[PDB]
What we know:
By secondary structure, chain A is α/β, with parallel strands linked by helices. Chain A contains 13 helices and 12 strands. Helix content of chain A is 41%, strand content 12%.
Amino acid sequence: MEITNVNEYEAIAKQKLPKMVYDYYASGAEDQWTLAENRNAFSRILFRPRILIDVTNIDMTTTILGFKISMPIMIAPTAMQKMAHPEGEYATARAASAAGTIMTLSSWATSSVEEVASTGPGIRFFQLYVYKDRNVVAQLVRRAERAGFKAIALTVDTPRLGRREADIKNRFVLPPFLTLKNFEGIDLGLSSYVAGQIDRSLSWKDVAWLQTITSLPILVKGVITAEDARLAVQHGAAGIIVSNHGARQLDYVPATIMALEEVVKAAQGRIPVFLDGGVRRGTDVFKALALGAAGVFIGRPVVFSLAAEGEAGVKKVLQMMRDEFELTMALSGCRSLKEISRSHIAADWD
Amino acid sequence: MEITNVNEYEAIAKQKLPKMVYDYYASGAEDQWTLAENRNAFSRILFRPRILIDVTNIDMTTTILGFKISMPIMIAPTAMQKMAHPEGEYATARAASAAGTIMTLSSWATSSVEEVASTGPGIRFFQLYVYKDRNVVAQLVRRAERAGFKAIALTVDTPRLGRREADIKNRFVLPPFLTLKNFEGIDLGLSSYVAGQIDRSLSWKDVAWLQTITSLPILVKGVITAEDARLAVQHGAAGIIVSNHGARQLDYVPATIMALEEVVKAAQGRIPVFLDGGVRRGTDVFKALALGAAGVFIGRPVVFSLAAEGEAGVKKVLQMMRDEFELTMALSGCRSLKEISRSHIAADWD
Amino acid sequence: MEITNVNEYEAIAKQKLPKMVYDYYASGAEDQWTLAENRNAFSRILFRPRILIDVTNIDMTTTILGFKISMPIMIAPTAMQKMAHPEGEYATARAASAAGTIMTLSSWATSSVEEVASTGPGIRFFQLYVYKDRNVVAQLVRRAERAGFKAIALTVDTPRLGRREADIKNRFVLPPFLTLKNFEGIDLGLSSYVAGQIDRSLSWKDVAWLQTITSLPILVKGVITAEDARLAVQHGAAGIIVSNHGARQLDYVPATIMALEEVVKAAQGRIPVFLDGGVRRGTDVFKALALGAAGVFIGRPVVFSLAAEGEAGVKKVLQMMRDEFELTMALSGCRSLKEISRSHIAADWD
Amino acid sequence: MEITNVNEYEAIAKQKLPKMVYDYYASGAEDQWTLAENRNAFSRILFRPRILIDVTNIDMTTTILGFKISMPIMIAPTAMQKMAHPEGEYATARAASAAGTIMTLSSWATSSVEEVASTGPGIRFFQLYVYKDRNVVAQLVRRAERAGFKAIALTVDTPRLGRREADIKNRFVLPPFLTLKNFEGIDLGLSSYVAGQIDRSLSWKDVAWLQTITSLPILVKGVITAEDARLAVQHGAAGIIVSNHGARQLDYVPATIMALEEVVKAAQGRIPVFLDGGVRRGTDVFKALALGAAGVFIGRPVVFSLAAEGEAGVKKVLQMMRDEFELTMALSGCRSLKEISRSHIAADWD
Ligand SMILES: Cc1cc2nc3c(=O)[nH]c(=O)nc-3n(C[C@H](O)[C@H](O)[C@H](O)COP(=O)(O)O)c2cc1C
Ligand SMILES: Cc1cc2nc3c(=O)[nH]c(=O)nc-3n(C[C@H](O)[C@H](O)[C@H](O)COP(=O)(O)O)c2cc1C
Ligand SMILES: Cc1cc2nc3c(=O)[nH]c(=O)nc-3n(C[C@H](O)[C@H](O)[C@H](O)COP(=O)(O)O)c2cc1C
Ligand SMILES: Cc1cc2nc3c(=O)[nH]c(=O)nc-3n(C[C@H](O)[C@H](O)[C@H](O)COP(=O)(O)O)c2cc1C
């Protein structure tokens, strides 16, 4: 009896993590309708597989912003990984490098850019918020650039934090020996401070502002309507991440897989569109690409596997998804990502 | 571990109220299909949120019939609140005044207009039925006007009472020290009398009749078809309340959120259209306004919180809904009620 | 704590009847999908009630084939009622007479036409099958005419019996002191004989044949497609009963409420169309009439209430449905059956 | 208390087979969504039965590739039947001969073509894979032809094996005294070898290749899109089997009953189209033929009944389906397979 699927790592995390920690990571907003729907919506898309195609050699490699990677599955920024495992972000960085894929570090990481860069080479993105204290935004950016990060993933769906009721009932707090390391050694305990820096005044001009302090590509994260996707194209974003923040912000927003297509269309092929939210199977990954995503990101499975198995756990999550994705490409008759078409899928709404 | 949502107050009420009292308040008509659907239909409406909008200052204030209030969440008339808590309607009136919103007192209240007016200033509406004994209707109206009530909410969906089977099995009766106080000190034990006064002969001309005995605005409560909404416009109603009476009348009528739009359209912007039935979240409130409601009313949560926590409980219900509604406005990109549009929502039936 | 709804009688029957007897009556065909759907399909139809209509006086009286009855709820032919209660069909006949409605006696009754006619006056219909031995068909008809039956309800959906698996597992047999009384005292133990008489060769010409041996009106029972309804009009049926035989024949036929309209349309107002299958509430009854039925029939509730309460039980089933139907008419704004329109309902499929 | 339906045999198999064996046979791919849907999709198709048609004599006989059989229900190739019962494929062959229907032997059978041919006469098909070692493909074909097999059923949906997670957790292995007998006595322990022979390079030209080494008709098994059905017509297949391999390959492919029609249309009446996947009732069989199948195949019920009852079990599965199919034809008004039309069914998607 073995661990055969990703979703199984969640069950194990849950039996061993303290309730407050598990809930923190697992929880969605309020009644968690979108949490559930993020997963459920993938079951409303079916396959239209082609048979008798030579599928000896499958090429999953892709190029993301000029960076060539091993597969179109990247890691989404989550937060305080050291609550899940001692090595926390170090383990996640070593597994992402090992897999030939990209990691997106959280500005709320319990590891700083430099300590993450000290694990070894590997393409890494840094997630950020346009904080109130703009001098602070510039030091994080500089520090990110220095440590060798290749792009900035700007969260644009959080003017304010959504209500995740378990945290309130669990009276959630960051454990004793941990710190938000990117906020230490710069010119400003920290949890509260960082929570207060979230600027609820941001507008499109603030994204323009960010482009004057950095030369790195900017990916607006949290776009789910065609209206905002076009504005992101306009204000010169390097790509859009169709996300609902793992369903932790506003409830009742659509499943990202359902909003995907509308956003992909609005972008008009100008920039790469990615997705995250509920991706757990190689089949999920295929559907997203057939719909138009240039790649997908995974969040919760990483923290869950980390908690269960340390670095071996994240290594395993990544191996399982590329294996399952390669078999799905084989069985659908696709020899490259370029071969995946809209016709290989049939959506409930078609 | 704390109370984070409104719906939780129902569970607590239920564990402490006598079965007969709980059932009385909780029950719907016959198989209670609409009871359930009143809640469930809100989950068939999704959001289309706008991002990167300055949401520093949210204005939830609205004007209802020339009365400016703090938010578009008002209290619906329920009945015999003193079965739930000693202070019963006094507690509900003090919490509504404190919140800057309107209370709708039931003609079946266990507190009279004057005793409710003795708690302090505050805008209040009075619910009534065109009783058989028309002399009685006039004394209630006069007494209401005197006590300072600003409008009459006329129930028009009850020619006869719907069958709520639990009451029959529980052999429901009003507890000993309580009375229907509005029916005492006027020119006519009381429960039976009041039950017999419900006139099953009422027609549109009876609404005209009511306008000859009062100068206060009349809101027809219980309109769910476009046909009746237009007749209400005609017979000079000051606004319509799309209601199904908390699903206690006829079963299998649509969820009020589903009938809302048809009624809003028929009214052609001439008069304000409100809604009640199943509103439990700030998200619910947003959907109703995006559909066209000028405001919403809450019924059961008030009695449930009253039973659990007295006046602090109702205070809490109101604070939770305005908090949750303000965050929903922030996350959808709306700085005023005027900014809420039809485009910020996507209904299953669109 | 009291019995408030019809469906409750089933639960009580079940706790007291021997498993074999309960199963016999309760069971549907094979996986019993249509059994369930017969009930479930009524929940896919909603109301569009009119308010403020004088509903002082409700007239539920209707005329069925020149016979004026108290309400549009009649009793369907079931079978061997004496397995459920000693008085069996005598009790059902006295309750139907008392209620001012029509009873349809089964040719499989454990009581004969004359013994049913000996309970008192009352309009009664007789259900039959065109048996193999045509001489037998003529004696039943004659005997029916003699005993004062007003019409023949001809089952046309049973060339062969459907598979009701519980009967097979229960090794079902008619209890010792009972007999199929209509098959005794005529020119032909009986259960087997009667089971063998079912003619699987019947065609439309056999219905013509029946009209040469009787002058009584013929109602073809078991029509669910528009094709067969038109043929029934042609071959001079006095009315059609949209039935699926209580879902005991072929599984996966539609719920009668779903097939109703197609049949009502095909009949083009030429003859009365009735319905049976899953009718348990006054609300059910309203929907059927709004769709076009001239009346409905109830089967299982009668045997269940009989088993629970004898004649008082059937009396109660009938009182509960007319009460619930009158309140539904009041709440929908209908003062006569003629006032019930298609516009007072909204079907999922509209 | 008796066994009345096929599905019941699964429950009994499960209580007596070792977990590893049961799981092997029962399992679907990954989350087994299509497994479930293979069954569930039959419930979305309803009947439109004709009444009063002489249904004395029902003719279920059909002709499949010039071979006249007793009914349109054949047996699908499964694998290693001797894990389920000692007699394994011998028992299945004797029951198929006895029933007057066709058996499809698996190339993974625990019995060889000749030993299956030694049970007696009977029409038999042989399932195969275009193995890597093409010399091996030719010996199996020759051996099949010799033993008297009439057609080849070529699996075309398995370039690679789908992930059936229970097998991995159960560490599945073929029991000690069994062997893949068709792979012994030819020019090449065996399980591993045979697993490695599956050629993931196959294309349409490989099907052309097969036609140069055999004169027997070729039925491409595993076609579910209209695109591939037309290519199969082109490359001269003798018929197509709409299959999803019992849902064990790729998950999220449609239920075969849902893909059926699209494939039947694409074939343009040129060649016979068959179906398998989830067929458990005589009603299932009718729906497939009304949709256009020339016949259906059953897989799992055979192994389950084998495990429960040996040869008597398979005999019983076949008798139950023809009985149930004949009654469904009687009740729908069909006297021959030719009489089954598209109009006798109404699909959810129509
Ligand atoms: C604990 C946690 C913290 C997160 N913090 C952020 C954040 O600060 N900014 C952001 O844009 N997304 C944040 N996310 C969302 C992820 O970046 C990603 O959108 C989501 O987790 C993907 O969905 P999934 O877990 O179903 O894979 C967070 C997610 C988790 C679980
Ligand atoms: C115990 C109780 C008594 C009520 N009495 C009346 C009434 O006399 N007249 C009326 O129009 N509505 C009455 N209502 C309905 C409310 O005014 C309102 O329509 C409904 O409660 C709102 O639905 P909700 O509880 O899901 O918030 C009553 C509701 C309850 C729970
Ligand atoms: C035990 C039993 C026997 C029945 N026998 C017949 C029959 O011989 N002929 C017939 O047309 N219908 C027969 N029916 C069906 C009823 O006449 C009627 O169609 C069905 O019971 C109505 O559905 P309901 O029980 O949900 O009210 C029988 C029903 C039951 C329960
Ligand atoms: C244990 C097992 C092994 C099978 N092996 C094969 C195979 O080697 N090739 C193939 O085309 N189908 C194979 N099938 C699928 C069957 O031929 C058929 O498509 C499927 O079992 C029919 O679905 P059902 O079991 O719901 O009747 C296998 C099925 C089972 C259960």
